[PDB]
């Protein structure tokens, strides 16, 4: 096993929990994995997918993002920074794609996941572009509870790693709808204690963040360093208590062994 893999071994052990990570290189395609076929929650980082099958609903449905959506008193769940200002009134889709990707706001991602008509729309598209692993089988508030053994809004390091690639670096979307996925993912507000907290602040991140219960704490990147090619690193973690606390600070250990180790 490579000095990686035993760090990161080794951070799982002094963690409490259990540890995924993916990461691939683009300068040479290289993947560096820990766990990284074993299923894990994903809690909020399934709103990327959820924004990217709505940028790609876009591609053919001209406007689509400029469309306003109806915030019902219904619809507000267990986190609604942006959504709980418009009640009554009306977002766009881009509007929600930016609450759900960089405030985390789960009452756009439930409208996100509406708009793809249910859960089941948001995991098509994920098969669409290739990931068999991806499953979304929830909404708004339930995905946040993260039961472990439970394959429900599950998908393993690899397949997410590979996915996130392909939304960003690669061609799974239209060349204005992956440029504004990359700038969601950069404007991220939620990040600063996670990846972003274990690279050099000189490299561009976008990410999305994610956390629920059994101390479920994730993140996943795209990254651009300076003087090497783009890497993608996604970070998984789950703890066997039902209400341990996050563990933000696990998943900067993980990607300072990353920045520092490939």
């Given at each position: 096993?490579?000095?990686?893999?035993?760090?990161?071994?080794?951070?799982?052990?002094?963690?409490?929990?259990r540890?995924?990570?993916?990461?691939?290189?683009?300068?040479?395609?290289?993947?560096?994995?820990?766990?990284?076929d074993?299923?894990?929650?994903?809690?909020?980082?399934?709103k990327?997918?959820?924004?990217?099958?709505?940028?790609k609903?876009?591609?053919?449905?001209?406007?689509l993002?400029?469309?306003?959506?109806?915030?019902?008193?219904?619809?507000?769940?267990?986190?609604?920074p942006?959504?709980?200002?418009?009640?009554?009134?009306?977002?766009?889709?881009?509007?929600?794609?930016?609450?759900?990707?960089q405030?985390?706001?789960?009452?756009?991602?439930?409208?996100?996941?509406?708009?793809?008509?249910?859960?089941?729309?948001?995991?098509?598209?994920?098969?669409?572009i290739?990931?068999?692993?991806?499953?979304?089988?929830?909404?708004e508030?339930?995905?946040?509870?993260?039961?472990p053994?439970?394959?429900?809004?599950?998908?393993?390091?690899?397949?997410?790693?590979?996915?996130?690639?392909?939304?960003?670096?690669?061609?799974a979307?239209?060349?204005?709808?992956?440029?504004?996925?990359?700038?969601?993912?950069?404007?991220?507000?939620?990040?600063?204690?996670?990846?972003?907290?274990?690279?050099?602040?000189?490299?561009?991140?976008?990410?999305?963040?994610?956390?629920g219960?059994?101390?479920?704490?994730?993140?996943?990147?795209?990254?651009?360093?300076?003087?090497?090619?783009?890497?993608?690193?996604?970070?998984?973690?789950?703890?066997?208590?039902?209400?341990?606390?996050?563990?933000?600070?696990?998943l900067?250990?993980?990607?300072?062994i990353?920045?520092?180790?490939?």
């Amino acid at each position: 096993t490579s000095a990686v893999q035993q760090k990161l071994a080794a951070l799982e052990k002094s963690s409490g929990g259990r540890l995924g990570v993916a990461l691939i290189d683009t300068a040479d395609n290289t993947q560096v994995l820990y766990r990284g076929d074993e299923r894990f929650p994903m809690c909020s980082t399934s709103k990327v997918m959820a924004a990217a099958a709505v940028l790609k609903q876009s591609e053919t449905q001209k406007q689509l993002l400029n469309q306003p959506v109806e915030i019902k008193p219904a619809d507000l769940v267990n986190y609604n920074p942006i959504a709980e200002k418009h009640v009554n009134g009306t977002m766009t889709l881009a509007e929600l794609s930016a609450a759900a990707l960089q405030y985390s706001d789960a009452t756009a991602m439930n409208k996100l996941i509406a708009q793809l008509g249910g859960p089941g729309g948001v995991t098509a598209f994920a098969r669409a572009i290739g990931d068999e692993t991806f499953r979304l089988d929830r909404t708004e508030p339930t995905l946040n509870t993260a039961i472990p053994g439970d394959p429900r809004d599950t998908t393993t390091p690899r397949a997410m790693a590979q996915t996130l690639r392909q939304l960003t670096l690669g061609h799974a979307l239209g060349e204005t709808q992956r440029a504004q996925l990359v700038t969601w993912l950069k404007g991220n507000t939620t990040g600063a204690a996670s990846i972003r907290a274990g690279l050099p602040t000189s490299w561009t991140v976008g990410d999305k963040t994610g956390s629920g219960d059994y101390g479920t704490t994730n993140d996943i990147a795209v990254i651009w360093p300076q003087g090497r090619a783009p890497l993608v690193l996604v970070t998984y973690f789950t703890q066997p208590q039902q209400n341990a606390e996050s563990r933000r600070d696990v998943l900067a250990s993980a990607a300072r062994i990353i920045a520092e180790g490939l």
